[PDB]
Amino acid sequence: GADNFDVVSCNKNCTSGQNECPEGCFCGLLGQNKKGHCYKIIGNLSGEPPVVRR
């Protein structure tokens, strides 16, 4: 089910080697760069009605 999951931002800068990302996120780096951003994997649940009252 790899096609069910998307990578999204976890809204934080990070550097490799330092445990800087929140749990459940990863530090995504481009190539040999030491600095990157925190990301996370999510799956969307579809089918929600257009309006929900709580």
Author numbering: 13 to 66
Paper text:
EVA3 was expressed and purified from Escherichia coli and crystallized readily. The two monomers are very similar, and the Cα of residues 13–56 can be overlaid with a root-mean-square deviation of 1.0 Å. Residues Leu57 to the C-terminal Arg66 are not visible in monomer B and are only visible in monomer A because of an extensive β-sheet interaction of this region of the protein with a symmetry-related monomer. The EVA3 monomer is composed essentially of a single domain containing a large antiparallel β-sheet composed of residues Phe17–Thr27 (β1) and residues Lys47–Gly55 (β3), with residues Phe38–Gly40 forming a third short additional strand (β2) interacting with residues His49–Tyr51 of β3. Two extensive loop regions, composed of residues Ser28–Cys37 and Leu41–Lys47 join the two major β-strands, whereas a very short α-helix is present at the N-terminal region residues Ala14–Asn16. The short β2 strand, which interacts with β3, is held in place by a disulfide bridge between residues Cys26 and Cys39. The first loop, between strands β1 and β2, is rigidified by the presence of two other disulfide bridges between Cys33 and Cys50 and Cys37 and Cys22. The topology of EVA3 is that of an archetypal knottin cystine knot, with the Cys3–Cys6 disulfide bond (Cys33–Cys50 in EVA3) traversing the macrocycle created by Cys1–Cys4 (Cys22–Cys37 in EVA3) and Cys2–Cys5 (Cys26–Cys39 in EVA3) disulfide bonds. The crystal structure also contains a cadmium ion present in the crystallization solution that binds to the side-chain oxygen atoms of Glu60, carbonyl oxygen of Leu57, and carbonyl of Gly36 of the symmetry-related chain A molecule.
Ticks draw blood for days to weeks without eliciting inflammation, and investigation of saliva of the brown dog tick Rhipicephalus sanguineus revealed the presence of chemokine-binding proteins.
